[PDB]
CSV table of C-alpha atoms in Angstrom, one decimal:
chain,number,residue,atom,x,y,z
A,299,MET,CA,73.6,124.2,82.1
A,300,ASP,CA,71.6,120.4,83.1
A,301,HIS,CA,74.3,119.2,85.6
A,302,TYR,CA,75.2,121.2,88.4
A,303,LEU,CA,78.8,120.0,89.9
A,304,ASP,CA,79.2,121.2,93.7
A,305,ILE,CA,82.8,121.3,95.1
A,306,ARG,CA,83.0,121.4,99.0
A,307,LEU,CA,85.8,122.9,100.4
A,308,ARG,CA,86.7,120.3,103.2
A,309,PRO,CA,88.3,122.6,106.5
A,310,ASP,CA,91.9,121.9,107.1
A,311,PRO,CA,94.2,123.0,109.2
A,312,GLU,CA,97.3,122.9,107.6
A,313,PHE,CA,96.0,125.8,105.5
A,314,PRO,CA,93.6,128.8,105.8
A,315,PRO,CA,90.4,129.1,103.8
A,316,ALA,CA,91.1,132.0,101.9
A,317,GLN,CA,94.3,130.3,100.6
A,318,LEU,CA,92.6,127.2,99.5
A,319,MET,CA,90.3,129.1,98.0
A,320,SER,CA,92.7,130.8,95.9
A,321,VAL,CA,94.9,127.4,95.1
A,322,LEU,CA,91.6,126.2,93.9
A,323,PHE,CA,90.5,129.4,91.4
A,324,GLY,CA,94.3,129.4,90.1
A,325,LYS,CA,93.7,125.5,89.6
A,326,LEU,CA,90.6,125.9,87.8
A,327,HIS,CA,91.6,129.2,85.4
A,328,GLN,CA,94.4,127.0,84.0
A,329,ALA,CA,91.7,124.0,83.6
A,330,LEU,CA,88.8,125.9,81.8
A,331,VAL,CA,90.7,128.6,79.6
A,332,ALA,CA,93.0,126.2,78.1
A,333,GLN,CA,90.8,123.2,78.1
A,334,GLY,CA,88.2,125.0,75.9
A,335,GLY,CA,84.5,124.8,76.0
A,336,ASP,CA,82.0,127.1,75.0
A,337,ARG,CA,80.3,127.9,78.0
A,338,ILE,CA,82.5,127.7,81.5
A,339,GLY,CA,80.9,128.9,84.6
A,340,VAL,CA,81.0,128.7,88.4
A,341,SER,CA,79.2,130.5,91.1
A,342,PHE,CA,79.2,130.8,94.7
A,343,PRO,CA,76.4,129.5,96.4
A,344,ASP,CA,77.6,131.0,100.0
A,345,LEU,CA,78.2,134.7,98.6
A,346,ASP,CA,77.8,137.0,100.9
A,347,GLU,CA,78.5,140.9,101.0
A,348,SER,CA,78.3,141.1,105.1
A,349,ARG,CA,81.3,139.1,105.9
A,350,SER,CA,82.6,140.2,102.4
A,351,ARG,CA,84.1,136.5,102.0
A,352,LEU,CA,84.3,134.1,99.0
A,353,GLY,CA,82.0,131.4,100.4
A,354,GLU,CA,83.0,127.9,101.6
A,355,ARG,CA,81.4,126.2,99.1
A,356,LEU,CA,81.9,126.5,95.1
A,357,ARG,CA,79.0,125.3,92.2
A,358,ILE,CA,80.5,125.1,89.1
A,359,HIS,CA,77.8,125.4,86.4
A,360,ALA,CA,78.4,123.6,83.3
A,361,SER,CA,76.8,121.4,81.0
A,362,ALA,CA,76.6,117.5,81.2
A,363,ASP,CA,79.0,116.3,78.8
A,364,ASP,CA,81.6,119.5,79.7
A,365,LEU,CA,81.2,118.4,83.7
A,366,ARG,CA,81.6,114.7,82.5
A,367,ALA,CA,85.3,115.4,81.0
A,368,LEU,CA,86.1,118.4,83.6
A,369,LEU,CA,86.0,116.1,86.8
A,370,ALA,CA,88.1,113.0,85.2
A,371,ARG,CA,91.0,115.4,84.3
A,372,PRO,CA,93.6,115.1,85.7
A,373,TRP,CA,94.3,118.7,86.0
A,374,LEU,CA,90.9,119.6,87.9
A,375,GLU,CA,91.7,116.4,90.0
A,376,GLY,CA,93.9,115.7,92.6
A,377,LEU,CA,92.5,118.3,95.2
A,378,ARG,CA,90.2,116.1,96.6
A,379,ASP,CA,92.1,115.7,99.8
A,380,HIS,CA,91.1,119.3,100.9
A,381,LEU,CA,87.9,119.4,98.7
A,382,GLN,CA,85.1,117.2,98.7
A,383,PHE,CA,83.8,117.2,95.2
A,384,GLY,CA,80.3,115.2,93.7
A,385,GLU,CA,78.9,114.6,90.5
A,386,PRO,CA,76.9,116.2,87.9
A,387,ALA,CA,73.5,116.8,89.5
A,388,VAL,CA,70.1,118.7,87.3
A,389,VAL,CA,69.6,122.4,88.8
A,390,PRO,CA,65.8,123.0,90.1
A,391,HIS,CA,63.8,124.4,87.7
A,392,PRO,CA,62.7,127.7,89.2
A,393,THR,CA,66.4,129.6,89.1
A,394,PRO,CA,67.3,133.6,89.9
A,395,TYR,CA,69.0,135.6,87.6
A,396,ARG,CA,72.8,136.0,88.5
A,397,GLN,CA,76.0,137.5,86.8
A,398,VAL,CA,79.7,136.9,88.4
A,399,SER,CA,81.8,139.7,87.0
A,400,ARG,CA,85.1,140.9,87.9
A,401,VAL,CA,86.2,144.7,88.5
A,402,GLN,CA,89.1,146.2,86.6
A,403,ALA,CA,90.7,149.4,87.7
A,404,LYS,CA,94.2,151.0,88.9
A,405,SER,CA,94.3,152.0,92.2
A,406,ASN,CA,98.1,153.4,91.6
A,407,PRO,CA,98.8,157.0,90.6
A,408,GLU,CA,102.6,155.5,89.1
A,409,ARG,CA,100.8,153.2,86.8
A,410,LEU,CA,98.8,155.9,85.3
A,411,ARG,CA,101.3,158.4,84.8
A,412,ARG,CA,104.1,155.7,83.3
A,413,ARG,CA,101.3,154.7,80.7
A,414,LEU,CA,100.6,158.4,79.7
A,415,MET,CA,104.0,159.2,79.4
A,416,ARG,CA,105.3,156.0,77.5
A,417,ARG,CA,102.4,157.0,75.0
A,418,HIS,CA,102.6,160.9,74.3
A,419,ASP,CA,106.5,161.2,75.1
A,420,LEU,CA,105.5,163.5,78.6
A,421,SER,CA,108.1,164.4,81.4
A,422,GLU,CA,107.8,162.7,84.8
A,423,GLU,CA,106.4,165.9,86.3
A,424,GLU,CA,103.7,166.5,83.5
A,425,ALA,CA,102.5,162.6,84.1
A,426,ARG,CA,102.8,163.4,88.2
A,427,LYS,CA,100.8,166.8,88.3
A,428,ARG,CA,98.2,165.4,85.6
A,429,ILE,CA,97.2,162.7,88.2
A,430,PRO,CA,96.0,164.2,90.9
A,431,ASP,CA,94.8,162.5,94.1
A,432,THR,CA,91.2,161.5,92.7
A,433,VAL,CA,93.0,159.4,90.2
A,434,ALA,CA,93.4,156.6,92.8
A,435,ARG,CA,90.4,154.2,92.4
A,436,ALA,CA,90.0,150.4,93.5
A,437,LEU,CA,86.7,148.1,93.9
A,438,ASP,CA,85.6,147.8,97.5
A,439,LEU,CA,83.9,144.6,97.0
A,440,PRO,CA,85.0,141.5,99.0
A,441,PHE,CA,88.0,139.8,97.4
A,442,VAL,CA,89.5,136.8,97.8
A,443,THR,CA,93.0,136.8,99.2
A,444,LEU,CA,95.6,135.5,96.3
A,445,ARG,CA,99.1,135.7,96.8
A,446,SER,CA,101.5,134.9,93.5
A,447,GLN,CA,103.8,137.2,91.7
A,448,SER,CA,101.6,140.3,91.3
A,449,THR,CA,101.5,140.9,95.2
A,450,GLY,CA,104.0,139.8,98.1
A,451,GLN,CA,101.0,140.1,100.4
A,452,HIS,CA,97.8,138.5,100.2
A,453,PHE,CA,96.3,140.1,97.1
A,454,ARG,CA,92.5,140.9,96.4
A,455,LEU,CA,90.5,139.7,94.1
A,456,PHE,CA,87.9,141.4,92.2
A,457,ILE,CA,84.6,139.6,91.8
A,458,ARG,CA,81.7,141.5,91.5
A,459,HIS,CA,78.1,139.2,92.0
A,460,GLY,CA,75.5,140.3,89.5
A,461,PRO,CA,71.9,141.5,90.6
A,462,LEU,CA,68.9,139.0,91.1
A,463,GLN,CA,66.8,139.3,88.2
A,464,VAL,CA,64.0,137.2,86.6
A,465,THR,CA,65.1,137.1,82.9
A,466,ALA,CA,68.3,134.6,82.8
A,467,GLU,CA,70.4,135.1,79.6
A,468,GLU,CA,72.9,132.2,79.3
A,469,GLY,CA,75.8,131.9,77.0
A,470,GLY,CA,79.6,131.7,76.7
A,471,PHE,CA,81.9,132.6,79.7
A,472,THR,CA,85.5,133.8,80.1
A,473,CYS,CA,88.4,131.3,80.3
A,474,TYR,CA,89.4,132.1,83.7
A,475,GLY,CA,85.5,132.4,84.5
A,476,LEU,CA,85.7,136.6,84.6
A,477,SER,CA,81.7,137.7,83.6
A,478,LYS,CA,81.0,137.6,79.6
A,479,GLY,CA,78.1,139.8,79.7
A,480,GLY,CA,75.5,137.2,80.7
A,481,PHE,CA,73.9,135.6,83.8
A,482,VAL,CA,74.5,132.3,85.3
A,483,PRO,CA,71.7,130.1,87.2
A,484,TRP,CA,71.6,130.6,90.5
A,485,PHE,CA,70.1,127.9,92.8
B,53,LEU,CA,100.2,113.4,146.3
B,54,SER,CA,100.3,116.7,144.6
B,55,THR,CA,101.9,117.1,141.2
B,56,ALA,CA,105.8,118.4,141.1
B,57,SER,CA,105.7,122.3,140.6
B,58,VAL,CA,108.9,121.8,137.8
B,59,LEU,CA,108.5,119.5,135.2
B,60,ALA,CA,110.2,118.7,132.2
B,61,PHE,CA,110.7,116.3,129.4
B,62,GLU,CA,113.2,116.2,126.6
B,63,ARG,CA,111.6,116.4,122.9
B,64,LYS,CA,111.7,113.0,120.9
B,65,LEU,CA,111.7,112.7,117.4
B,66,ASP,CA,113.5,115.9,116.8
B,67,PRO,CA,114.3,116.8,113.5
B,68,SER,CA,116.5,119.4,112.2
B,69,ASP,CA,115.9,121.8,109.0
B,70,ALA,CA,115.2,121.2,106.2
B,71,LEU,CA,116.9,122.1,103.0
B,72,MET,CA,115.6,122.7,99.5
B,73,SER,CA,116.8,122.8,96.4
B,74,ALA,CA,115.7,121.7,92.3
B,75,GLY,CA,116.2,119.8,90.0
B,76,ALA,CA,114.3,117.0,87.5
B,77,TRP,CA,111.8,114.2,88.1
B,78,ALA,CA,114.2,112.4,85.8
B,79,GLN,CA,117.1,113.3,88.2
B,80,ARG,CA,115.2,112.2,91.2
B,81,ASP,CA,117.1,108.6,90.8
B,82,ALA,CA,120.8,110.6,91.8
B,83,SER,CA,119.9,113.9,93.7
B,84,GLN,CA,123.5,114.4,94.5
B,85,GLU,CA,125.1,117.2,93.0
B,86,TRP,CA,121.4,119.1,92.6
B,87,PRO,CA,121.7,123.0,93.1
B,88,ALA,CA,120.3,124.8,95.7
B,89,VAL,CA,117.3,127.5,95.6
B,90,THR,CA,118.7,131.1,96.3
B,91,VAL,CA,116.5,133.5,98.0
B,92,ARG,CA,116.0,136.6,96.1
B,93,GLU,CA,114.2,140.1,96.0
B,94,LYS,CA,111.7,141.7,94.2
B,95,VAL,CA,109.4,141.8,98.9
B,96,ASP,CA,111.1,138.1,98.6
B,97,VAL,CA,110.2,135.7,96.7
B,98,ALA,CA,111.4,131.8,96.1
B,99,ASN,CA,111.4,130.0,93.0
B,100,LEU,CA,113.3,127.1,90.8
B,101,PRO,CA,115.4,127.7,88.3
B,102,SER,CA,114.6,128.8,84.9
B,103,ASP,CA,114.7,125.1,83.7
B,104,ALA,CA,113.4,123.0,86.9
B,105,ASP,CA,110.6,121.1,87.7
B,106,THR,CA,110.8,118.9,91.0
B,107,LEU,CA,111.4,120.3,94.2
B,108,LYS,CA,113.7,118.2,96.9
B,109,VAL,CA,113.4,118.3,100.4
B,110,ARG,CA,115.9,117.0,102.9
B,111,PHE,CA,116.0,116.5,106.7
B,112,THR,CA,117.1,113.8,109.2
B,113,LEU,CA,115.3,112.7,112.4
B,114,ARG,CA,116.7,110.8,115.6
B,115,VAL,CA,114.6,108.7,117.9
B,116,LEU,CA,116.1,109.5,121.4
B,117,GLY,CA,113.9,107.2,123.7
B,118,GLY,CA,112.8,107.7,127.1
B,119,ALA,CA,109.8,109.9,126.5
B,120,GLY,CA,108.6,109.2,129.7
B,121,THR,CA,111.6,110.0,131.7
B,122,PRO,CA,111.4,113.6,133.5
B,123,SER,CA,114.5,115.4,132.9
B,124,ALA,CA,113.9,117.4,136.2
B,125,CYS,CA,111.5,116.9,138.9
B,126,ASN,CA,110.8,117.9,142.2
B,127,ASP,CA,109.6,115.2,144.5
B,128,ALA,CA,111.1,111.3,143.9
B,129,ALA,CA,107.6,110.0,144.7
B,130,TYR,CA,105.9,111.7,141.8
B,131,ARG,CA,108.5,110.4,139.5
B,132,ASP,CA,108.5,107.2,140.3
B,133,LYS,CA,104.8,106.6,140.1
B,134,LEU,CA,104.3,108.5,136.6
B,135,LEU,CA,107.2,106.1,135.3
B,136,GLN,CA,105.1,102.9,136.8
B,137,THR,CA,102.3,104.5,135.0
B,138,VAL,CA,104.3,104.7,131.8
B,139,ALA,CA,106.0,101.3,131.8
B,140,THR,CA,102.1,100.0,133.0
B,141,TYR,CA,101.3,101.9,129.6
B,142,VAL,CA,104.2,100.3,127.1
B,143,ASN,CA,103.6,96.5,129.1
B,144,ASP,CA,100.1,96.7,128.1
B,145,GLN,CA,100.5,97.8,124.7
B,146,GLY,CA,103.7,99.3,122.8
B,147,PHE,CA,103.7,102.3,120.6
B,148,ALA,CA,103.1,100.4,117.8
B,149,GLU,CA,99.8,102.7,117.4
B,150,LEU,CA,101.9,106.0,117.4
B,151,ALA,CA,105.1,104.3,115.4
B,152,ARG,CA,102.5,103.5,112.7
B,153,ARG,CA,100.9,106.8,112.7
B,154,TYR,CA,104.0,108.8,112.5
B,155,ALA,CA,104.8,106.4,109.8
B,156,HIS,CA,102.2,107.5,107.6
B,157,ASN,CA,102.7,111.7,108.3
B,158,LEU,CA,106.2,110.6,107.0
B,159,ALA,CA,105.4,108.3,104.5
B,160,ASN,CA,103.0,111.2,103.0
B,161,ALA,CA,103.9,114.9,102.3
B,162,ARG,CA,102.3,116.7,105.4
B,163,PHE,CA,105.7,118.1,106.6
B,164,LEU,CA,105.3,120.1,103.3
B,165,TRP,CA,103.0,122.8,104.2
B,166,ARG,CA,102.2,124.9,101.4
B,167,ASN,CA,104.6,123.6,98.1
B,168,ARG,CA,102.3,120.4,98.0
B,169,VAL,CA,99.0,122.2,97.6
B,170,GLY,CA,98.8,122.0,93.9
B,171,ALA,CA,101.1,119.3,93.8
B,172,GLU,CA,101.0,116.4,91.1
B,173,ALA,CA,103.3,114.1,92.4
B,174,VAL,CA,105.1,113.8,95.7
B,175,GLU,CA,107.6,110.8,95.7
B,176,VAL,CA,109.2,110.5,99.1
B,177,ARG,CA,112.3,108.2,99.9
B,178,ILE,CA,113.0,107.2,103.6
B,179,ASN,CA,116.2,105.8,104.3
B,180,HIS,CA,117.9,104.1,107.8
B,181,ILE,CA,121.1,105.4,108.7
B,182,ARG,CA,123.4,102.9,110.7
B,183,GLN,CA,127.3,102.6,111.1
B,184,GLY,CA,126.9,105.3,108.0
B,185,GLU,CA,125.3,102.5,105.6
B,186,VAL,CA,122.0,102.3,104.1
B,187,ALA,CA,120.3,99.4,106.3
B,188,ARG,CA,117.2,99.3,104.9
B,189,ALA,CA,115.0,101.8,102.6
B,190,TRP,CA,111.4,102.6,101.4
B,191,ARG,CA,109.7,104.6,98.6
B,192,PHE,CA,106.0,106.1,99.0
B,193,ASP,CA,103.8,107.8,96.9
B,194,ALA,CA,102.3,111.2,99.0
B,195,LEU,CA,99.4,111.7,96.4
B,196,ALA,CA,98.1,108.3,96.3
B,197,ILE,CA,98.2,107.8,100.2
B,198,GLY,CA,95.6,109.7,101.9
B,199,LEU,CA,97.1,112.3,104.0
B,200,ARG,CA,93.9,112.4,106.2
B,201,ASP,CA,93.6,108.9,106.2
B,202,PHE,CA,95.5,106.3,107.7
B,203,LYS,CA,95.4,103.1,105.7
B,204,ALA,CA,97.9,100.1,106.6
B,205,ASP,CA,100.5,98.7,104.5
B,206,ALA,CA,103.7,96.5,105.2
B,207,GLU,CA,106.4,99.1,104.7
B,208,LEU,CA,104.6,101.2,106.9
B,209,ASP,CA,104.1,98.1,109.8
B,210,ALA,CA,108.2,97.5,109.3
B,211,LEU,CA,108.6,101.6,109.9
B,212,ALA,CA,106.3,102.1,113.1
B,213,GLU,CA,108.2,98.7,114.6
B,214,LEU,CA,111.8,99.8,113.5
B,215,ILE,CA,110.2,103.1,115.7
B,216,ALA,CA,108.2,101.8,118.4
B,217,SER,CA,112.1,99.9,119.4
B,218,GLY,CA,113.6,103.3,119.2
B,219,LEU,CA,111.5,105.0,121.2
B,220,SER,CA,111.5,102.0,123.8
B,221,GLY,CA,115.2,102.4,123.8
B,222,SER,CA,116.2,99.0,121.9
B,223,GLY,CA,118.7,101.0,119.8
B,224,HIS,CA,119.9,104.1,117.9
B,225,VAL,CA,117.2,105.4,114.8
B,226,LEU,CA,118.2,107.5,112.4
B,227,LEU,CA,115.8,108.6,109.5
B,228,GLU,CA,116.9,110.7,106.2
B,229,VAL,CA,113.4,112.3,104.7
B,230,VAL,CA,114.0,113.1,100.9
B,231,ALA,CA,111.0,114.6,99.4
B,232,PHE,CA,110.1,115.0,95.5
B,233,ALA,CA,107.7,117.5,94.8
B,234,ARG,CA,106.4,118.3,90.6
B,235,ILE,CA,104.8,121.5,90.8
B,236,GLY,CA,106.0,123.6,87.0
B,237,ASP,CA,109.0,125.5,85.8
B,238,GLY,CA,109.2,128.8,87.2
B,239,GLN,CA,107.0,128.1,90.2
B,240,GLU,CA,106.7,129.5,93.6
B,241,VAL,CA,107.9,127.1,97.0
B,242,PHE,CA,106.3,128.3,100.0
B,243,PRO,CA,109.1,128.5,102.8
B,244,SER,CA,108.6,129.3,106.3
B,245,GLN,CA,108.5,133.0,107.1
B,246,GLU,CA,110.9,134.7,109.6
B,247,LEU,CA,110.0,137.8,111.6
B,248,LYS,CA,108.8,139.9,104.4
B,249,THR,CA,112.0,137.7,105.1
B,250,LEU,CA,112.1,134.1,104.4
B,251,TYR,CA,114.4,131.4,106.2
B,252,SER,CA,117.6,130.9,104.7
B,253,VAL,CA,120.6,128.8,106.2
B,254,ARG,CA,124.0,128.5,104.2
B,255,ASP,CA,122.6,131.1,101.3
B,256,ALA,CA,120.0,128.2,100.8
B,257,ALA,CA,116.4,128.5,101.9
B,258,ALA,CA,114.8,125.7,104.1
B,259,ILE,CA,112.3,125.5,106.6
B,260,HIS,CA,112.3,125.2,110.6
B,261,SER,CA,112.6,122.4,112.3
B,262,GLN,CA,109.9,123.2,114.4
B,263,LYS,CA,107.1,123.4,112.0
B,264,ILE,CA,108.1,120.2,110.6
B,265,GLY,CA,108.1,118.1,113.9
B,266,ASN,CA,104.5,119.8,114.5
B,267,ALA,CA,103.0,118.3,111.9
B,268,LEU,CA,104.5,115.1,111.8
B,269,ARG,CA,103.1,114.8,115.4
B,270,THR,CA,99.4,115.4,114.0
B,271,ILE,CA,97.9,112.3,115.7
B,272,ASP,CA,94.8,113.9,118.0
B,273,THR,CA,91.9,112.0,116.2
B,274,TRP,CA,90.1,111.6,119.5
B,275,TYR,CA,88.2,115.1,120.5
B,276,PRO,CA,85.3,114.8,122.0
B,277,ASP,CA,83.3,116.5,118.6
B,278,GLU,CA,84.2,116.2,115.2
B,279,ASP,CA,82.9,118.3,112.3
B,280,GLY,CA,84.8,116.2,109.9
B,281,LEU,CA,87.7,118.2,110.2
B,282,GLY,CA,90.5,115.4,110.6
B,283,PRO,CA,93.5,115.2,112.8
B,284,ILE,CA,94.8,117.9,114.7
B,285,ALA,CA,98.3,118.6,115.6
B,286,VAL,CA,98.3,116.9,119.1
B,287,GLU,CA,99.0,120.7,121.6
B,288,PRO,CA,97.7,121.2,124.9
B,289,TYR,CA,94.0,122.2,125.0
B,290,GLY,CA,93.7,120.7,121.3
B,291,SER,CA,94.5,124.4,120.4
B,292,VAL,CA,94.3,125.3,116.2
B,293,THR,CA,96.0,128.5,115.3
B,294,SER,CA,94.8,128.1,111.8
B,295,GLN,CA,90.8,127.3,112.5
B,296,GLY,CA,90.8,129.9,115.6
B,297,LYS,CA,89.0,127.5,117.5
B,298,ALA,CA,90.0,125.7,120.0
B,299,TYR,CA,88.9,122.0,120.4
B,300,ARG,CA,89.4,119.7,123.7
B,301,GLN,CA,88.4,122.8,125.7
B,302,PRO,CA,89.4,122.4,129.6
B,303,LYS,CA,85.4,122.3,130.7
B,304,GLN,CA,85.4,118.3,129.2
B,305,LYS,CA,87.2,115.8,130.7
B,306,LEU,CA,89.7,115.2,127.4
B,307,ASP,CA,91.9,118.0,128.4
B,308,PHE,CA,95.6,116.8,128.7
B,309,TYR,CA,96.5,118.6,132.1
B,310,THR,CA,93.3,116.9,133.6
B,311,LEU,CA,93.9,113.6,132.3
B,312,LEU,CA,97.1,113.3,133.1
B,313,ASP,CA,96.4,114.6,136.6
B,314,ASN,CA,93.9,111.5,137.1
B,315,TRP,CA,95.7,108.7,135.7
B,316,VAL,CA,98.8,110.2,137.9
B,317,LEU,CA,97.2,111.1,140.9
B,318,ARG,CA,93.9,109.1,141.0
B,319,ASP,CA,94.8,106.0,138.9
B,320,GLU,CA,91.9,106.7,136.6
B,321,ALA,CA,92.9,105.3,133.6
B,322,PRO,CA,91.4,106.8,130.5
B,323,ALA,CA,90.2,105.3,127.4
B,324,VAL,CA,92.9,104.0,125.5
B,325,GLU,CA,92.6,106.8,122.7
B,326,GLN,CA,93.1,109.3,125.4
B,327,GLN,CA,96.3,107.4,126.8
B,328,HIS,CA,97.8,107.7,123.3
B,329,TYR,CA,97.5,111.1,123.3
B,330,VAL,CA,98.8,111.8,126.7
B,331,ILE,CA,102.0,109.6,125.5
B,332,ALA,CA,102.3,111.6,122.7
B,333,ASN,CA,102.1,115.1,124.5
B,334,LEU,CA,104.8,113.4,126.5
B,335,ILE,CA,106.9,112.8,123.7
B,336,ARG,CA,106.4,116.3,122.4
B,337,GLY,CA,107.4,117.7,125.7
B,338,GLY,CA,106.8,120.7,127.7
B,339,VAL,CA,106.3,122.5,131.0
B,340,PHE,CA,104.0,121.6,133.6
B,341,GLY,CA,103.2,121.4,137.1
B,342,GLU,CA,103.6,125.2,138.3
């Protein structure tokens, strides 16, 4: 990534930080996966595990040509009122190894029992008894509040931050920005 | 000359509930007969009809006037002194500054709280109803106009003059606000939550009157310390719910109560900005004294 674009979310009284960042992530998801591109990635420079927050600013790590069209796109724009966005800047030569990822697991015994009974044609009791209380697992990492048709209340967003390494392997990222199995430049 | 234990000021610029409906941007020209948005169950969420890309919000606004005029006051001397100070302020300078700021808020989509977020095009049309007829209309664009920045415009100036006249008591003023926001097909609106229960009138979703009047009065931009946040809804003690921090603390001299007490009893004229803030607070109304 030869150009780094730093999008700083400006504080606003009308909306909270969590809702604003959720809107930002949602808007970016459609602006990156649908738009295409070989490598599309962003990182949270303010990420801290003490407060369990997602950071007060975001950094989109992409190429120079990729960022040139990303900011100009209408979808990715228009939110300049609440967020301060600059232009691409060359990242510092020293860089750490960090991979941002998402944790996928189900915390509901019902989903597992239904999925099992709808495949092997089991009974209601067979699926209920087969799912014990030790089968309910969910990520405990910091999860930003994203409210959508999935959950009425604030729903957690599972984001896994990769440990710091020396060797940094780049490559193509996901569409919604999920980890594709490689780290990203950490500045 | 102590203060009056009983003080009340009737609110001015009091809006009504804000109804919501759905339609298409093409149909914006003639919003009549637009189907309303009905609450549904899943918790409860409200989404536009299957084929609808534009949201409509309609709420009226009245200008009563006589902001400084107290509804109830224990002492006559205090009331007269207050009225004199208010008259002096009006004579020196008119409400054109407040009217202009209010005009900007109405032009932009600041009233809408969450629906505007992620809104590509918001078109507002503010009419003027006199004797049942539309005397003069105006059409603005919320997206192009800065939400946190105040810019001068001919239409805005004319609207500010009309509002200033109404507040001064020249004549009755009625404003019909209509907003159109492009979100997307099957998107989810964010109405005012009720104590999840969504606010609904006549089996139609809407937004609370106070929730709109709170945003319309975001005129507090003179706080002692600025971190770049922008205008804060005019409130005593400059309190902010979302930020969880209270600016314009009582320790300083910028406090509303302190400023009013000094400017009335002690005849200490505060900065012009503070005078505007005090007039805005009086317009909002409340309970003072003891």
